[PDB]
Write a protein that binds this ligand. Structure first.
Ligand SMILES: O=c1ccn([C@@H]2O[C@H](COP(=O)(O)OP(=O)(O)OP(=O)(O)O)[C@@H](O)[C@H]2O)c(=O)[nH]1
Lengths: 140, 30, 65, 254, 161, 124, 123
């Protein structure tokens, strides 16, 4: 109303995360907000935030690339919602593995996806990317 | 090169666009 | 004369002379001429944080020539 | 009622806006009248500067064969509300973008606008307070910085605004070739019938010593810069008066 | 997208006389005395003009040969055909003399010798001489000496008349 | 899906232009960010493009009407958003049917402009 | 008398600041004179210094409330009006109690800023 400061970098991404079409499960929503809160999305472009969220929820990059060392904390374990709702994300039981998963997901996402996305110039590829990101808004 | 060996409505739009761009450039020259 | 040997350019030589000439003008008339020999210019580059980084490549004041 | 007073508050703001804009019109009026002397007193300082640099060359061969930095020094106003002067200048600069282009714009609008659009091409700018009269020292500061930006520069261009009349402000260009290319052309004019109007001038300068020639080159280059900034200021004040009147009428219609 | 050159808007060009042409007897020199893009005199017919260039003093009369002179801080005199003398003082610049009968004297500063004050000039010389004594380095001394040369020229110029 | 995405993008563009129109009227169009100038130009073309000569108003319009197939409406607007038609004159979109009609009108306008330029140049 | 004088000065400064805000939107902060900007800078601190976290709104704010004494309030505002705290950062006056809390918050702001500078320096 009145410079890439941290509040201004994360504020835009929070706004982008607020776009939804269907209600979101508590585990998926809280995790995504925590990631954007702790700066895990600073390197992610605003346009790609929804695509980043979709992979985090409906996919697991660590397992895809064989770099997942977590024991229990995975986004496909829907039963973790009640454990999170009991202990909090910022607790020793869940905090350590939570950060590891986010760190792996961020590194894999930036390396394998954002680099290719920023390298698209073909009209066909550009149009395909546009459809993907818009769909990601209406998916997660 | 190997593509050379073995190997329309949208074309009309491209053709018209090229002609219009050419005319707008030609008027600029003189 | 001897200023060329020190690297001083001709343009800086003229600025010094003009300031000196304006100095000798009567106090009544000094106001008019002195407005033509009062440095008010700077060289700035926008800093990374959004500030002004002043380039010191060329002097502004005749004293620092 | 609040709804009625909402309009009253809205109309209350427009009233203050009209007064403030009215104040701007008066401030610019005084500076326009003060700067209106240049209209009378211009058009005679740059007579032999024409012979030094007036070369109606093609617009393609000049930029196509650039093997060294081409420095541009567009003139832009510090404050907005001037009109389309800055916009046109940007269009004029965008039309000449090249690999070797370096930008040293003048004015806050110039630095901010050209920093974001052409990052690598912008090196740094010069900002001058509109407190004193546009003098020689300011022009010398422009040239010295321009050389240090790119000493091995093929040309230094100045893109400014020429105040033809109260309602006519064109975009004008001063191209200044560096010493090596200028002395080479000065050598051909003296030795050949070509560049006839420069034949006597070329021989006259050729006789005298080199340091004098270098001083002559720098001196006239400063004058061209001085003329551009002086004209750009006069065009600025004239344009602001026109623009401010438009804002007054728009704020009156509301 | 071609842009006009800034000299196209200037309608007073310089007229050069062809080398293969007859001579003309001229009794007037068209002087153009200019300061910081401002003409104090414009195409003024004068009898003669005296200018102090680096090598020495030049008295330019109509028909003077083509020459370029690098001025130095000094007085400049203009004598009209009527018999009136007008004296300015310049701090530098160039003087272009054309065989067609024109003289364009462009100066960084050109002030009538009346405006200058000898009392102010004299005391400034004393101060600068003191400044030269306290000058830190060679460059500073050279700058101070530039001021003194102008001041002494001003002082000598006024003491002459 | 393509129809939905194009429609939303058009609405967003027009929504932003409305907000920028408040500033434009008071101060002026030249006091805006260079990014917002591009949006304004695209928005103005969209507004002109949305107009259409109806076959029932051949008297009030004076022009033959048009029937635009939905598949041409989507493609024409989608291309315009991408910016491939930025060079086209703004008025070319006024009172026309599909993108093809826009290009044909632009061609005629260019031909008339070239004729005027030729007449002006020959006057020298 | 001090209480009355301080209150009137605050009201006058706030009134003047609102008139300037109209100028700041049309001309911009740059055009304001030296005196005007000092009023603007001081007035903004007054606006934020009037805010106070209540002991009952801890859930809403997430911070402990403060109970400011009458004398502390008068002295704190009196110093602010005459520029005793011109160098203090503006945000140090936001959602705090007396002047002492302002200084502590400013110190905390300085420490975190230094840490950020150190982190940037290592990079
Ligand atoms: O070492 C030198 C040699 C020559 N010159 C200068 O080169 C110029 C060549 O000029 P000319 O040879 O054409 O004539 P000139 O000597 O009679 O000219 P003036 O001195 O009256 O101006 C003259 O002006 C001369 O002073 C120097 O200044 N230094």
């Amino acid at each position: 109303a009145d410079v890439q400061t941290i509040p201004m970098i994360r504020g835009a991404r929070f706004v982008a995360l607020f776009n939804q079409k269907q209600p979101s499960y508590f585990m998926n929503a809280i995790v995504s907000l925590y990631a954007c809160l702790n700066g895990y999305l600073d390197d992610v472009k605003v346009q790609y935030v929804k695509f980043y969220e979709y992979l985090l929820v409906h996919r697991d990059l660590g397992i895809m690339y064989g770099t997942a060392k977590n024991k229990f904390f995975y986004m496909y374990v829907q039963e973790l919602n009640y454990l999170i709702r009991f202990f909090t994300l910022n607790s020793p039981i869940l905090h350590g593995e939570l950060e590891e998963m986010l760190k792996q997901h961020t590194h894999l996402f930036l390396q394998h996806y954002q680099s290719k996305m920023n390298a698209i110039k073909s009209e066909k590829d550009v149009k395909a990317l546009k459809n993907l990101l818009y769909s990601c808004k209406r998916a997660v | 090169e190997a593509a050379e060996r073995n190997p329309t409505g949208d074309n009309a739009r491209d053709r018209l666009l090229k002609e219009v761009l050419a005319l707008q450039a030609r008027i600029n020259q003189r | 004369s001897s200023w060329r040997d020190h690297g001083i350019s001709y343009l800086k030589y003229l600025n010094v002379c003009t300031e000196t000439l304006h100095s000798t003008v009567k106090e009544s008339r000094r106001a008019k001429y002195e407005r033509w020999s009062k440095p008010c210019y700077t060289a700035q580059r926008p800093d990374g944080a959004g500030g002004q980084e002043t380039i010191d490549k060329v002097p502004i004041h005749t004293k620092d020539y | 009622s609040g709804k009625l007073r909402l309009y009253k508050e809205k109309l209350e703001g427009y009233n203050r806006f009209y007064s403030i804009v009215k104040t701007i019109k008066m401030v610019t009026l005084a500076k326009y009248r003060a700067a209106q002397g240049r209209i009378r007193t211009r058009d005679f300082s740059l007579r032999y500067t024409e012979l030094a640099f007036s070369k109606p060359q093609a617009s393609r061969d000049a930029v196509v064969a650039a093997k060294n930095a081409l420095v541009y020094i567009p003139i832009t106003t510090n404050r907005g509300s001037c009109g389309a002067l800055n916009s046109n200048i940007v269009r004029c600069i965008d039309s000449v973008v090249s690999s070797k282009m370096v930008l040293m714009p003048v004015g806050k609008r110039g630095i901010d606008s050209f920093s974001k659009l052409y990052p690598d091409e912008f090196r740094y700018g010069i900002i001058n307070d509109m407190k004193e009269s546009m003098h020689f020292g300011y022009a010398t500061f422009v040239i010295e910085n321009a050389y240090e930006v790119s000493k091995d520069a093929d040309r230094y261009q100045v893109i400014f605004n020429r105040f033809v009349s109260a309602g006519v402000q064109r975009n004008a260009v001063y191209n200044i070739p560096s010493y090596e290319k200028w002395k080479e052309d000065l050598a051909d004019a003296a030795s050949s019938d070509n560049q006839k109007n420069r034949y006597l001038f070329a021989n006259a300068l050729q006789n005298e010593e080199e340091q004098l020639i270098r001083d002559f080159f720098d001196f006239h280059a400063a004058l061209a810069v001085l003329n551009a900034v002086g004209e750009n200021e006069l065009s600025e004040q004239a344009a602001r008066l026109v623009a401010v009147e438009g804002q007054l009428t728009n704020i009156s219609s509301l | 997208h071609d842009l006009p050159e800034g000299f196209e808007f200037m309608e007073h060009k310089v007229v050069n006389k062809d080398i293969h042409a007859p001579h003309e007897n001229l009794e007037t020199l068209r002087l153009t005395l200019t300061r910081q893009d401002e003409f104090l005199l414009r195409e003024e017919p004068v009898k003669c003009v005296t200018v102090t260039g680096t090598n020495g003093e030049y008295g330019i009369y109509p028909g003077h040969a083509y020459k370029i002179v690098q001025l130095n801080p000094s007085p400049l005199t203009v004598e009209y055909t009527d018999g009136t003398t007008k004296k300015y003082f310049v701090s530098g610049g160039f003087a272009h003399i054309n065989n067609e009968g024109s003289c364009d004297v462009n100066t960084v500063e050109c002030t009538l010798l009346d405006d200058l004050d000898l009392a102010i000039a004299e005391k400034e010389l004393a101060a600068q001489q003191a400044a030269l004594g306290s000058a830190k380095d060679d460059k500073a001394k050279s700058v101070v000496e530039i001021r003194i040369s102008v001041i002494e020229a001003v002082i000598a110029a006024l003491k002459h008349h | 899906v393509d129809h939905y995405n194009v429609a939303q993008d058009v609405v967003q563009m027009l929504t932003k232009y409305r907000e920028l129109q408040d500033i434009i009227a008071v101060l002026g169009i030249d006091e805006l960010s260079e990014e917002d100038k591009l949006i304004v130009d695209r928005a103005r073309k969209l507004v002109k493009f949305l107009s259409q000569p109806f076959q029932v108003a051949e008297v009030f319009t004076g022009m033959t009407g048009h029937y635009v197939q939905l598949d041409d409406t989507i493609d024409s607007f989608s291309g315009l958003l991408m910016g491939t038609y930025d060079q086209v004159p703004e008025m070319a979109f006024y009172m026309v049917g599909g993108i093809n009609s826009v290009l044909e009108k632009a061609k005629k306008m260019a031909e008339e402009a070239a004729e005027l330029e030729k007449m002006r140049r020959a006057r020298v």
